[PDB]
Every structure is written in C-alpha cells, then in structure tokens.
C-alpha cells in the first residue's frame, strides 16, 4: 500500500519518499522542490525516463518499492 521511492538529484543527493500507491505525485514534486528551495516548475521528474505528471500515481506508473525517480532541470 505504501512504497518508498528514491528521488535522485542532479548532484547525486537523494531524498526518499514514502507514498501510497494512490498518491498523486504532485505531492512528491512539491515536497522535493520545497526541500531544495527551488520553484516546482523549474524541475522535471522522470520515472524510467518518462515525465511524471501532477496526477500520476505510483499504481498508474507501475512503481515498486525502492524505485528511482530522477530530477532534472526543466527543458528550455
């Protein structure tokens, strides 16, 4: 029901999140950006290379315990 996801930043640091399978991943994006002190819209969050939308859930994306989310600067 809850899984732990590892969010890896551009500098190789990690913040882990415990989320429900039904959680909207906007909440992870907002929390991560808050902790980094950057605007949420300055970042893109990828799972298996694909962009995570605000309304995506772990269940929708097939995420599993200890899966990795990568954070990159938004494209320009």
């Amino acid at each position: 029901e809850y899984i732990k996801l590892k969010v890896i930043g551009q500098d190789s640091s990690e913040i882990h999140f415990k989320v429900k399978m039904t959680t909207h991943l906007k909440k992870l994006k907002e929390s991560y950006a808050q902790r980094q002190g950057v605007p949420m819209n300055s970042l893109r969050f990828l799972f298996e290379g694909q962009r995570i939308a605000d309304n995506h859930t772990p269940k929708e994306l097939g995420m599993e315990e200890e899966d990795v989310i990568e954070v990159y600067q938004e494209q320009t």
């Binding site: 809850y2 732990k4 913040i15 882990h16 999140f17 415990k18 959680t23 992870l28 929390s31």
Partner: peptide, 9 residues
C-alpha cells in the same frame, strides 16, 4: 548525507 525519508499522504 544522512538518510532522509519523508512520508506523504
């Protein structure tokens, strides 16, 4: 860095 785990929802 120390381990950091944040619970959501």
């Amino acid at each position: 860095a120390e381990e950091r785990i944040i619970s959501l929802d």
